[PDB]
Ligand binder design. Structure first.
Ligand code: HEM
Length: 154
């Protein structure tokens, strides 16, 4: 699939706002993921013990990881589709080391959309959300294709 320049502009415009507070956005997104789909928390040996949202909010380690994740996602989005290089190491670790099914990538996509919608209503109207969804679908399709090449496609 291919996004138009106009769609990339809507994506990068809302992402510029997210970048004003990467740590806060990372926290909100991961917590949303873990609360909505608790099964995903089981994949993290380091966070598996967190029992409540309060505990999740207080975790310095979870917050640091959220920053790592958003920074990696941000680099991919800024490539505007030309992310083959950035996708390789990411797909390898998530397929082979962490073993993350595509289904879980859909869950985090939903968490990202939910948080942008709550925090940036003025910059995340219907068109902007459509563009973000298309960007994340492209991301998932390309990761799924790499998963298959690596022997996982899980
Ligand atoms: C937009 C989606 C995603 C991005 C950009 C992303 C990015 C990253 C990055 C950059 C790291 C660091 C180095 C590495 O291991 O490759 C990481 C680690 C990891 N990721 Fe993701 N990830 C995503 C989604 C997921 C999902 C949905 C799951 C699980 C439900 C997952 C589970 C993990 C685990 C288990 C680790 C290692 C945590 C640790 O160091 O203890 N990832 N991810």
């Amino acid at each position: 699939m291919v996004l138009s320049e106009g769609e990339w502009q809507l994506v990068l415009h809302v992402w510029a706002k997210v970048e004003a507070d990467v740590a806060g956005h990372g926290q909100d997104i991961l917590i949303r993921l873990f609360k909505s789909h608790p099964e995903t928390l089981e994949k993290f040996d380091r966070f598996k013990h967190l029992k409540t949202e309060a505990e999740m909010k207080a975790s310095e380690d979870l917050k640091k990881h959220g920053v790592t994740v958003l920074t990696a996602l941000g680099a991919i989005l800024k490539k505007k589709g030309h992310h083959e290089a950035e996708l390789k190491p990411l797909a390898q670790s998530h397929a082979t080391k962490h073993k993350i099914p595509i289904k879980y990538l859909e869950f985090i996509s939903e968490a990202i959309i939910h948080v942008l919608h709550s925090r940036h209503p003025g910059n995340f109207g219907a068109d902007a959300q459509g563009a973000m969804n298309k960007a994340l679908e492209l991301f998932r399709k390309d990761i799924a294709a790499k998963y298959k090449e690596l022997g996982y496609q899980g």
